[model samples]
Target: STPIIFYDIAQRPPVAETCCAPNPWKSRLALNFKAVPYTTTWVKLPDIERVCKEIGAEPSLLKEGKPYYTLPIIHDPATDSLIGDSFDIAAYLQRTYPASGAGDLFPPQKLDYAVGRDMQQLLFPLSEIRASPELADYARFNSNVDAAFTAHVGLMVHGLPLDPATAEVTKAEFVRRAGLSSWDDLEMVGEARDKMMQSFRNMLGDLAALFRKDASGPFLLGQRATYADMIVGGWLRMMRATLPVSEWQEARAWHGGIFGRLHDALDKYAEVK
Candidate 1:
């Protein structure tokens, strides 16, 4: 079997010279955790659709009515499978290589990442969610494809550097895809920044509340880190790479340092190759 082709998005060197996108980072973590032998093929942000199409990777989502193509797409020559989206990629690895890895991504319990890509779709019975209400905070946390976290630190499009050749055009393409008026719309400053800071703090508070369920944890599952931990950690890793020193320090101090701890625990899995 040939090595898996792990598709990653290319960004200008500094943080992203390795990996920085949240979803791809999650998939990268899963691959590394499972000890799967793979290689990365970086795709430029603007070239995502073309590359995905050329590789026969299907789009898992739709944005503004058109099919939306994103990264963390893996091509497994082992099975001749092309998997897209981080959750699906994890599920595939979990099922396909269950015996190879150290951690069980889809464990018997603590399924908060059931939030997966979809918000309304629950992975199990209501009693589970009811019992672990703060577990629902996964959505409030990293569930926005890491969208929620950026509101405070800064937006991903604005934070991560892009290929200078297409940087401006790529960003404009992003705005068009998201149906926003301009890149300026992503900027959050002034009093609105103040409001989002409090809200972001509250988001941290809620995420911290879930960690209190098992006080011994650096993970939601306590001691044993699951894919759910990586789910949130993926975004935190993004913040780590994209944010400046002082701003990242602010995140490290949030929520009793649970995010910081989890970030550290999983830091071993931050490899790009």
Candidate 2:
């Protein structure tokens, strides 16, 4: 009777943080937040070739054997229909069960009101990694890690780069401005990383101000948890935890305690994850 089947491992090959939302993992989070009662099965997507095929979710949709599909596919046993795409599915669930009160991701009041302005205002720079090209050389020397959230968010939402690049400069600037660094010893050799990091910090400052102005909001728009809170709160927590703490205090300070609160809320939805 379960409506969703999240294909993912609980550990090893960690889930994407807010700034990074790997398809399978992020979809897991959305499903959890939506609080849907369903069966949970753990399996890495790489191992999913067979299972996905069985559920009508194939890498290619050409023949009945498989259908080219995205991760986090929901196979409704009743209807024999598979649904993927995280955001789309999340909204669909809310619509199907309106009593949950998780509507439209960002609520209409928040979007049309002042909150939307703040949300749109800081979205630009947060998404762009200006120093990506310049740092390509330095990044070549180190171990590479491709954050799924950054990759997905970069392509779909944020403007950050996905390829390996000298992240030291970006990391350092993030440290200097936000007071947190990814590593103790950083090599800032590129201008693009610097700019990109600066842009995020700037956006953080704006967010800080917005939060400061309306201290009453447990969520970004006020009492209820809206889509804005889901995204921003999620992304900020990952950034703060992953980045070095001592070096980039300002960035964390800008976000203040909102990140922690968001994470706590996320934990409440752990039953779904």
Candidate 3:
């Protein structure tokens, strides 16, 4: 069996925060759930595109009018195959490794976008959560996230480091991506923070409603853990690892402990030895 080479975003040392996207966790959780043996290669944000192309994997997303490759790309040398897209990877696992004892991620005959990109979309506010004061210290490779994010934007658009002298040009791109009109409008606290939390609350509300529809054990689909469970579990674990206790508690309470219980159940699979 050729080892699966799992590429994840490089963790910044000290803080070691993973990048703020949820897609990477989708394939990660699936691989773990399947008990697949794999090795992780951590690639820096700036090098994702270059490294991915070297493996013959195309960008899964487009950003700033250019191809933006992302992490969670995997290569299975046994079959001489390379795959991108977390959801696609999960489907591939289910198709190729049927006897892995991970069980099927998709419920039989009901795979209607069961990978659920919508669920990932609901967590978009999490991107902004990195801007919080408690996390600000770890927000940058060196300095504040504003400058770091601005630098990223500058590089994306111009293929160079953000010029400290002409930073406003890059800042404009950052503001555009952040859905704000200007840098003065970037809010790490006050109304913006509250609004982001409310979005979390609303997301939990959606989950709570789904859980209420089925009072069964442990997962979204009754007693067994399916791909849907992995999807929920991935984001829950990601947020729990990064969020403040208060926020975690609030989200926990909304689904009446379902999220907490599910997370604990999934933890064993997620632990990498």
Candidate 4:
């Protein structure tokens, strides 16, 4: 009997089959590390709300004046609990199964590790890249028309199959959010692309510097791998499926393959269907 039920998202093709979105993988890594027994049920973008609602899960985010339900939700029958957020899921597993032997993520020195680092600096660049043509082009070819169109409309993780009118509105919304007047503006798009690349470069540089500070680590926390590593691994794995090899090769080269090695370490959990 499965005591825990994990709801995972269905991305397009290769990405969908392997690796997976960061949020879900976060829970996956924790569960695997703890050796928790659970079963996975894949949900498409459009069905996330209906599935979660039926399972008694709550909305974690609201968008466009509607409750936006997300995946990586865990339902624990023994506890009669339904958790919706990834970080929250990790915490739940930690508290609920302390005897499972998996080490803690938020250690005593959490502040020491978190000092002086701005997460927005790293995330903004990634967000810009997601809104760029590069990602759109990649998604278009790798995914089916419906998935591609959905992603193009800015539902990166949740590519819901919306009606034609909704799709057009969503596409415009995404473009507007990216600070573009229209998707047809080639000149502005080129500038945006350049900015995204620069941001990526900066992000990679900062990451490499962090890795270079200590030589003994195959992980962030010296010898032990923590939830932090899982986070990076999840993003890298998603990048592996979406971003071009050449683009990532540059990131890999920064810390002399630290990023690549990190990806390799977590690769085992990224099982493809």
Candidate 5:
């Protein structure tokens, strides 16, 4: 089979970081290390609504494949088989080209990356929820969360101006949901915020540790660049860039420019733009 073509909508798509946005850069890194040859074509996943209909591909979401519909999907040019979903595509590529950079996403030799893997499974659901408009609602709100909750979250992570208009709307919404008269009654919101922050920090801390461990040379696995390094590195860069510097901190200092190293590796692939 010929190399698969990738369809990615990394930017503008609300589902960028979690899906194949990371995979493209990661796979490119893998391909370089192994000297594998594959052609890639990236089309915006969200923009594929027209293309999907054009290609005679059924709308998966309108049916039972909503999650599958809204993600990074791949197609084999040689055979025209579609590979939907990020992990499955990555796994297929890794398995097909074992010597390539896709090597050791799940290392049989060491288990140090288990925390990174676990954190991915736990927190990514929320990441998905955040992007999924269907899931973004009052019912999904943590009751333990206070009224000021979403405001604080957006402020902390996104730094959207907490000015009067924004604050007024957010506060009013919070009061309506929390059933409280004053913003001062938003203490439980703070508690829930602490929990979320703790969880996020712990995950980042493990990532930092992974970076340190795999930094002896570069990459998370300590030797050859593995999927762990590429996956985590891609996300670290994206998240660090997206978040307020005060909150997430600049990622450059970590791994001693290892993130740059990964990008350099990806430069050989024509499709990575």
Candidate 6:
């Protein structure tokens, strides 16, 4: 009689109570916001495809015409659907249970509204608005920021608490999937690392300003927790889990400490199950 079964990727040292990937956090936040009862079924990286197939979760992306599967899948037995893509999962939850008084992930908007224009609908009284200064909206889907994090963080399974043999194979498979010759290529070198870090900070600079736009915020629109907050917080959570403790501490101070405050606020729903 399970209502929802959330499929998440497992992390080592359990630095987090739940998953680590950025995409998964979106659906996880939606699920938590709706106060839906669910259970976690953790999947290992090596077995991601296998588990998806077993659960009948369809691929959300295509790699050169072939289906590419990823996690943050959900099995909603109540409706008998298998959804893996994070955005689709959130969409499904919102449509299926709009009666929840907990809160909303997406603001109510027109049918043709895309995520970029979605933020314009959520505003506060006496709050100023301008099309050009909406950096948080831009940062919500900023590819450069995500790219910098991936390269700098070396998106490998190196730090997870897997045994030596499993760790080697996991990382090796990662290189092949990423189409890289060496795992070392994942790490940015001296100049490259500095450059990417600069890009990251610059990309997020306006976002910090956006967060500071409101004196009451721990969210983009002051006190209201919306999907915009989740979008940025999702990536922030990934960085929190993998980045060096000292370095991350520095990130907390970036953009006038807005990110750190935002992360802390949204983290209440960062539960695993």
For each candidate, the alpha-carbon lDDT, in order, equals: 0.66, 0.42, 0.54, 0.54, 0.44, 0.62
Which model, 4 or 5, shows the larger lDDT? 4
Estimate, for each residue in 1-273, the C-alpha lDDT of model 5 and write its tens digit. 576565654343333332323334444444444455565554533332422321222232111234444335566665565766444455556556656543444453333433233355456553342323422221122111222222233323332223333556665665667677866455334666567666655444544555566556554556565544545554443344345565454334443555545445433432343
Q: How many residue pairs clash (N, CA or C atoms closer than 3 angstroms) in each of the candidate models, in the order given?
A: 0, 28, 1, 0, 2, 0
lDDT of 2 at 35: 61
Candidate 4's residue-wise lDDT over 1-273, tens digit each? Answer: 856888976544443465346557767877777667888877655333422332232332112333443567889997998877665576678678866745665443221222324355545642333322322321222222222122222212222233343556665665666677875542223565556556655555554554455568766666566655665565565556545466567666555788877777766555432
Off by over 4 Å in 3: 14-20, 46-69, 109-187
Candidate 2 vs 3: which has more lDDT: 3
- For 9-63, candidate 2 gives per-residue lDDT tens digits of 3322333332222334345555566666556555433312322321222231112
CA displacement after TM-score superposition, residue 253 of candidate 5 (Å): 4.7
Writing each residue's lDDT as its tens digit, candidate 3 over 129-151 gives: 33333222221211221222222
Q: Model 1, range 1-273, lDDT digits (tens) per residue? A: 589998877765542464566778888888989998998887754444532332222332212343443567889998998777676687789889988867677665544432454434445533332322333353233345354454454433345655667667866776777778977765555576557667877877766665657868687878887777887788887778776576678877887787888889887877777
Q: Candidate 5, 194: how far from true, in Å?
A: 8.1
Ranked candidates, highest TM-score first: 1, 6, 4, 3, 2, 5
What TM-score fits each model?
0.73, 0.51, 0.63, 0.63, 0.49, 0.71
RMSD of each: 6.7, 13.3, 12.5, 11.3, 11.5, 8.7
Task: Pick the winner on lDDT between candidates 1 and 5.
Answer: 1
Candidate 6 lDDT over residue span 103-203, tens digit each:
76666422111334434435532233332332333433433334434444542222324435566676577678778887666544557556766766765
Question: In model 2, what is the error at residue 74, expressed in angstroms?
Answer: 2.7
Q: Give the TM-score of candidate 4.
A: 0.63
Best candidate (score: TM-score): 1
Choose 3 or 6, whichever is better by lDDT.
6
Model 6 misplaced regions, further than 4 Å: 13-18, 47-69, 108-163, 169-185
